[PDB]
Amino acid sequence: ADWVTGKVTKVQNWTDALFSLTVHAPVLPFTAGQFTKLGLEIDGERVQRAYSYVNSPDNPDLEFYLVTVVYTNDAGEVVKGKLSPRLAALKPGDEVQVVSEAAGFFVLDEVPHCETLWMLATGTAIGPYLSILRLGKDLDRFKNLVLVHAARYAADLSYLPLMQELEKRYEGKLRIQTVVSRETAAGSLTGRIPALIESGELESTIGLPMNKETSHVMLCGNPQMVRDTQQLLKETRQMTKHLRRRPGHMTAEHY
Template sequence: MTLDFPVADLPTPDAKPASTAALMPDAQTVTAVRHWTDRLFSFRVTRPASLRFRSGEFVMIGLPDERGKPILRAYSIASPSWDEELEFYSIKVPDGPLTSRLQHIQPGDQIILRPKPVGTLVLDALLPGKRLWFLATGTGIAPFASLMRDPETFERYDQVIMMHTCREAAELEYGRDLVAGLHGDELLTEMFGADFDKRLVYYPTTTRETTERMGRITDNLSSGKVFADLGLPPMNPAEDRAMVCGSLAFNIDVKAVLEGFGLREGANSDPKEFVVEKAFVGDGI
């Protein structure tokens, strides 16, 4: 996402609602908006006919400021590469230059979308393996929402584990809703069998509100709790692959844990056992 989007969304005075200017460059039309909490929302927009991307990549989106100058941020595409529309998942920053406006968009409004996707959270950046771990905090789940909805992910891996951590239980609802929908998807069940719910595992935890499962991803990995809970062996470089998306501090900490299991960081040009989204520079607060 960055990818706990938006990126570097610093306070600015006199924030105004989203613009609906009709002649913005690279304009796309909002088709749906859903507010999950007072801090989180998702939205869908039309897809440029020329846009081709790999599930897990991000693009620059934004709105014009009062002078018409684009305010752009990196947002992971949360929809899969086959979808006819594009979905995004965002935090709300009341005084942020972009999200102070973006959080007010409604169907029919327009946003700017630069159709040049990039990113490291793609399947081709990993060596073949047995299990794929998605490790995310907050809106860092967005690129994995794309990958979880892409059948190619399950063609390449026997099992996908989505570890998602937020402060409060309500902030996990986007992920819960997504995974529940995938578990009930008739096409995926037909393609991958009646036990598809065992092939896609959702492991949500909170760090502030008391819930059934708590703790940071790094702690649950290092202590072995997640492996015990799921009946899996500890990560090993022969079978396990991982993708990481969250705050800069989170990415650094998780990288150290994964390297402790013997996994090596890869890239598009040099596939290894795990990849980290490097576009992230801040959480916009």
């Protein structure tokens, strides 16, 4: 891993907690769905975390979709994460450290032939799919594309305008769906992805089945969502985890 100096060119504050950074950095070409590392000097030490590219690999304007992390530590204190709020405080012109070579296997080349490719994401994890769909390479292999974005509230569906523009571009091949867990909102299904798969509601709304005979499922995001969806698909649909030596029906990347 080689660190290069990047320059923030744009900061888009979708909500109080959700933001996308546009960066100029001399990174190497990458495969859509891959991630790199962003770094900032905090108390004299470089602090680094992984962030997925949201931009098509053919676009030199690097885009990152992030959330300022908040958690309850072991002492019972409610605290912010180390790097995310520092990334949220960057302004155009500010420097950010970027790893030149991308990493990751959450890519189309790892996806076998299928009728329907399901792209399921929570929160900021819609990013890799947007990189894949914007580029449009190798989607000819799949008859149907389903992009599902789950978040807590409708206001958190930051890329809904891009999803709508991608739906128009794909002329019916791409089906889009938003999911909201903490409210009811017009145009969105209410709940969590595993429960909506199990109840048959997601498939009924989309108009396509999710089964081992026709589908490949990509999972990105919340580690509990990834773990719960993989357990449901294995237990109830006999869909196996795709691992380095054992191919399968599910490709996962937790954040």
